[PDB]
Design a protein around this ligand. Structure first.
Ligand SMILES: *[B@@-]1(O)O[C@H](CNS(=O)(=O)c2ccc(Cl)cc2)c2ccccc21
Ligand SMILES: [Cl-]
Ligand code: NA
Length: 359
């Protein structure tokens, strides 16, 4: 119950708690890490029917914040020499050798610039064989590397290749190598039986309990579930990579490097990157329909900002996630909800908290 405890509680109550009523959200976890200390705020219920409160054990679906762990895995393999970002996917998924998609390099897959991969796989692509056929039948549309189109199949293929280069399934890459390296104890691609009691239900617009369904390359694109304490540890690792062993430290740093620019947004690996201080409008623009849903011409980076901040939104059918951190301020914030709320609301509430907090 320190002054800082009470300040952050007030700030989160002022800016995040009203969203519970506005959007009829059953449960929420909001955490701030500042000065290497975690402040955790919990609201409502992880399970309505069970009257089980959200707490530090509650497991939430991260949605596209999962892409940050896929990016980290990629940075890990790259800096161990298992892959080069200049490689093409057929070097590792041999069935793609000598197909058109084998002209796209791993960095372009990871940062969504293949020129012909949409937000989602086609509805009809479900089985492993259908995914393989999808990529074997793939052909270019836009000039490769020139257009960013935010895409699950794109970074999902990147993650599959990362896993192949490590001779392990993607779920094991994260659960056996990446999560332990980051110090995470309750982060999962597949929640085990002994943790199902901690796995929140998500809630749709009818307030029915739902969880993410299986989908093609789901694990690298949107398949991670985690707790508020683990996500604050992940933010700590991004704030303080020098404190971690070389292999994961290099991976974390690798994910921070901007690869190209779209207006005021720099695309890093998984993370979106901005010059800091960033305006609220800049952060909102990054999640506009134009940026999220449409192709945008990229521009090569002339000068990466010397002072930066990073964020990422994530959603599943039943869950919302937002993460943000600012190295120069040694501060970050995580929001987890078990009902989707508009991305702009997540960005606005986090902006108000991080800019009002005493430094
Ligand atoms: B992942 O969380 O990001 C994408 C897109 N998410 S979304 O909620 O469909 C969305 C967000 C903003 C706009 Cl402007 C449009 C749409 C995604 C897609 C499927 C699964 C996981 C994720
Ligand atoms: Cl999202
Ligand atoms: Na998809």
């Amino acid at each position: 119950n320190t002054p800082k405890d009470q300040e952050i509680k007030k700030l989160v109550d002022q800016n995040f708690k009203p969203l519970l009523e506005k959007y009829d959200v059953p449960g929420m976890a909001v955490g701030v890490i500042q000065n290497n200390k975690k402040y955790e705020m919990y609201y409502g219920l992880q399970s309505v029917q069970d009257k089980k409160a959200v707490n530090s054990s509650t497991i939430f679906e991260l949605g596209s914040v999962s892409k940050l762990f896929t990016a980290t895995a990629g940075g890990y393999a790259k800096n161990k020499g298992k892959i080069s970002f200049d490689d093409t996917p057929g070097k590792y998924w041999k069935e793609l050798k000598n197909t058109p998609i084998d002209q796209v390099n791993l960095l372009q897959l990871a940062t969504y610039t293949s020129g012909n991969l949409a937000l989602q796989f086609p509805d009809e692509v479900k089985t492993d064989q259908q995914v393989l056929t999808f990529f074997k039948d793939w052909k270019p549309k836009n000039s490769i590397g020139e257009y960013r189109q935010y895409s699950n199949p794109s970074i999902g293929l990147f993650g599959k290749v990362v896993a192949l280069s490590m001779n392990k399934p993607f779920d094991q890459v994260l659960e056996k190598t990446i999560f332990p390296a980051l110090g995470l104890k309750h982060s999962y691609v597949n929640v085990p039986k002994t943790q199902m009691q901690n796995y929140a239900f998500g809630y749709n617009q009818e307030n029915q309990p739902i969880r993410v369904n299986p989908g093609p390359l789901d694990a690298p694109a949107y398949g991670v579930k985690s707790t508020l304490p683990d996500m604050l540890s992940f933010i700590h690792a991004n704030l303080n990579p020098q404190k971690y062993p070389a292999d994961i430290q290099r991976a974390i740093n690798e994910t921070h490097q901007g690869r190209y620019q779209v207006n005021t947004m720099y695309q890093a690996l998984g993370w979106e990157e901005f010059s800091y201080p960033a305006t609220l409008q800049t952060l909102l623009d990054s999640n506009s329909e134009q940026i999220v849903m449409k192709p945008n011409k990229v521009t090569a980076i002339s000068k990466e900002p010397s002072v930066k901040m990073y964020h990422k939104t994530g959603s599943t059918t039943g869950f919302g996630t937002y993460v943000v951190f600012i190295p120069k301020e040694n501060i970050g914030l995580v929001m987890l909800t078990n009902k989707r709320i508009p991305n702009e609301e997540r960005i606005k509430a986090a902006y108000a908290v991080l800019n009002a907090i005493k430094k």
